[PDB]
Symmetry: D4
Amino acid sequence: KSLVGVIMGSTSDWETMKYACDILDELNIPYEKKVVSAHRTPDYMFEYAETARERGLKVIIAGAGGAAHLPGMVAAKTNLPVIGVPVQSKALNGLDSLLSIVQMPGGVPVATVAIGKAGSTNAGLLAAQILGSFHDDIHDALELRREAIEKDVREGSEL
Amino acid sequence: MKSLVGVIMGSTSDWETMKYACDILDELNIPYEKKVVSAHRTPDYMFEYAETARERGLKVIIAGAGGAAHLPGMVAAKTNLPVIGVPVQSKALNGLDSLLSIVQMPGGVPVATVAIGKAGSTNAGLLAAQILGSFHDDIHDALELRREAIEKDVREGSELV
Amino acid sequence: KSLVGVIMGSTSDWETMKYACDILDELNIPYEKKVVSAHRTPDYMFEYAETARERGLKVIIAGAGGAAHLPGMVAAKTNLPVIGVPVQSKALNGLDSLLSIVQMPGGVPVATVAIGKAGSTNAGLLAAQILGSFHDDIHDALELRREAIEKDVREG
Amino acid sequence: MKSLVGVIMGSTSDWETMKYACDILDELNIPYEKKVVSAHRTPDYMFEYAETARERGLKVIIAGAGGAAHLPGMVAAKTNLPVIGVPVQSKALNGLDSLLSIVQMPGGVPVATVAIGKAGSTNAGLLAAQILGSFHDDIHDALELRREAIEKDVREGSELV
Amino acid sequence: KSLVGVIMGSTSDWETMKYACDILDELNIPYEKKVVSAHRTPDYMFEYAETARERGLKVIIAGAGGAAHLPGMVAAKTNLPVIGVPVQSKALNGLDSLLSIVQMPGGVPVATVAIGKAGSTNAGLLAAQILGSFHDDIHDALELRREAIEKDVREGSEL
Amino acid sequence: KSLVGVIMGSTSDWETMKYACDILDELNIPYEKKVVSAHRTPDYMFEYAETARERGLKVIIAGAGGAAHLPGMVAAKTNLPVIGVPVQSKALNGLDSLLSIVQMPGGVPVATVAIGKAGSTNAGLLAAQILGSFHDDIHDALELRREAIEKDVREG
Amino acid sequence: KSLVGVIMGSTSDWETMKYACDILDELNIPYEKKVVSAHRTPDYMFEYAETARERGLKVIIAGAGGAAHLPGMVAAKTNLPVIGVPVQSKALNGLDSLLSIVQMPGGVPVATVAIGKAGSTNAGLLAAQILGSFHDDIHDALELRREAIEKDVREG
Amino acid sequence: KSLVGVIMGSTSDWETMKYACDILDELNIPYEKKVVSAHRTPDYMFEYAETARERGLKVIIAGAGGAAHLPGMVAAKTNLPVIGVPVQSKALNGLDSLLSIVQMPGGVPVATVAIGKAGSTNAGLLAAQILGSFHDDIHDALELRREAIEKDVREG
């Protein structure tokens, strides 16, 4: 039973969105991953968003670039938390993606993370933290993961 | 009269910007409808509006939005009428967010984007008229006459006194 | 027992952050609100973040502008979800605030919302949606609220 | 065949971008002409091209330019055909200069602006078709069919395997 | 006999362009000032540019904002030096004006000055410097003006 | 006797500034080219600017990137027209170069041209146009050059 | 004997630059304040920078806006640390000022602080910190000031 | 005994930060270099900043990119001067890094230098200049280095 849905408008977004999925796998959180396009499959996008809650999802992670409407339009159609990953665009380096996603109007939040792969990693982590607010074992796994990275960084600290 | 142009915007506060497009349509006697349709607050209604636009006899839609300005692009995803997007000047980023959100549409879903704010809104009305004028000679002729009068006005007021 | 902490670096951020608090009040979600500064009270900020989970908080909303470090540093110190509100800054209109908050490196997410008051409203709603993923009554409230706004916009 | 769309650009190096618009027109069987017309290097020729476009039977002009991208706007000042402006990605500023130079046209002279680069160029072709499709049903129907096929393609390739 | 033409697309540009004209007056350089619009009077603009040289002008100062095409299109139609003043626009504060003017392609220079009133002052000064490269008295007037400002600034220097 | 000085802060700017020099060569305008740095040779830069007029120069072309001060500081030290070429910088793609050059305060104009090689070409042409305002033969050359390019573009 | 020089190109920059001075006054660090313009008094600017060290200054704080060359050109002429305050410009809100100051090439550092009044305050504090690296009492005064602010923010 | 600490959040920043170190080596200023991450080792970062003064450091050079909090958070925890190097980030080319570092609020200065390698070089030179305010020999070494560069640029 998937707890997180990871969606993106194009197969070319996968290069970015795989990082989020890697985190969910590392933390043993069941998820689904789909191509859902705001612009090329708008009706399907509404159906996906609409039914997410009934289907058992708790969080949706959505990636898009350019005029990046997928996270916001999904967010308009569900009251699950929606995390938006700005995919790095070719001309404007994800500045268009970022502003298109983060600047949502009052009433329809999108939890926006960094442009590109760091954000995608962070979307996975943030989905986990959301689950971890009620699942202690996920919270504990997040703490352990962070503690291991801290130790790794600090003990390789000399240059 | 059957509307040829739909002028829509996500919020009543956008009207201060969008009224300029309507003024142009009025000046050129182009029948139109104006509605508040919000991508984010009335998403199902937005799809219904877009979906049915062609059946309803509309030829062009002008859509205004600011910030994460998704109204024009999502309407455009749902109709093959030409969709003209007016970036409303946002408070923090002065319509830069509005502009990039509207203009940077992916291959397959064009939005005809005009200038941020009131100049763009005027121009949305004129562009809707130009679209119509590609098959309505009288609208094309009116546009020419309008432009010619402005040219004369400017060139004959050309001394700075 | 507070479920949400709403924090900001300066009392001058309250004009922006009150909007998040108004949403929490509307939805009857218990919360606490504090001035916690990354730069002027850095130790206190660590202690706040560190103990949030023990204290029963589920989500933190943090507002900051300029070189806006509060949300990210709090997120570095807790695995509670942290929502960052970029406060509109004077010179650069919140662009500095936004980039300072959203561009967090892998490992330390901050859920970033829009620059200014719209973002603040949305931080309250997003905190609620986080709660609502497990509390059905909060979820149903969010759905009802949204449906009433849809009707109001469509009809009038 | 009588051209319905003129596709112009200031430099042969812009063709790498502009060819996408032409590809769309070809796919939809819309007759068109393509010319190098430079605002800055052939200014008189640009005016002549714009001026005569309507007489010559064109209904829409697609114009690409980068940097200080004046071609679309100056063509638009000289015709009341709809003019679609494609911002070509510039070397230093990645088409930000191109975009602002094109989209920020003053009241009176709209330019239908699309995305920077190749996505915009594709979209210029589609938008020219949508303009035509407002009075040519078959072009409108083709656009619908095209969009419907893409929708099916995307939704049925929707699992990431 | 005017030596400099000062042109702008709109009467609302005058608030900016008057600074250039004030300098020309201060330096006793004869000039003309006209509204010439790239977008609303395109043919007139070409005629103005075309005939400038025959008419005895040596430099044109052109102001425009937004999608600011007047300086560049004038420059495409004459080989007089053309100085472009980016007028501060409402939404983007003259960033559009600046890029529209300065980013000319190889073959058609526009001498671009600062956004707004400082640039307009500077357009007047730059037109004078261009004349001053061959008229010694104008060069000497520029030196004297600059020397007086230097003395003024330095001697009011304590705060 | 040089009529134009073409200067730049670093030898790495030559890749950009050679384009201006190519135009001057094409038009047979005598010029000198030098490395003159606002930041590494500030005194020399003042001396260069100061003496330009005595030395018979009529126009200076100056290229610089990043915090691009060369054109403005030279312009502060001469009433010759100074043309500033923003060199494309690594991180910010000449945006810093452009703003550093064009945004001169009242009193000290710099004639700014496009970022990079197009601007450099244009600095040469603009220097020539300045000369051509009084030398008819240079003006006529510029007209002929432009007419040949028009024909080439329109026909082929 | 002044330890810090606070300079700016225009009297209109004083509104911004006073904040730095207020900090120096608060900490009892002797300073001088002068209008020194890179573009309108270039020779004077070189003389000021050149003689700073001989005159007993340890740090220079320089404010400028737009094409903001003052800090960098002073820094090219002294090896005292130079702190640059980007003054908020009218059109571009200090983005020009910031890029013009901070993007200095290898060899000529400028210590750049925030756009506007916050930056100016911080230029004063940074000058003090530099002095405080060798003057214990200045360092201790900085710690006390920061501690008092911490307490004020955390408690009220 | 190290006089300067050079720190960065990630080993991948070393490519940039080495330039600062090379300058310190050239000038024979003892320094230490460490990975200290604001977001991945926040407690360690506080301990490093807190103890810097007791440990004998006079200046800290800190590099960070993206949401670049390291310099500012270290600066919140010490009254040593802290120099911030904006590391060039992938998407936004260090614009995020720059705004995240330079826009510090009143009370907590960071001395910000250019984006990337030029900035890093300059952080080393600026640290030296700070020391050179009280160490004549460092000051003199800075003058000699600058004079040699001047000669090299002017002559060849």
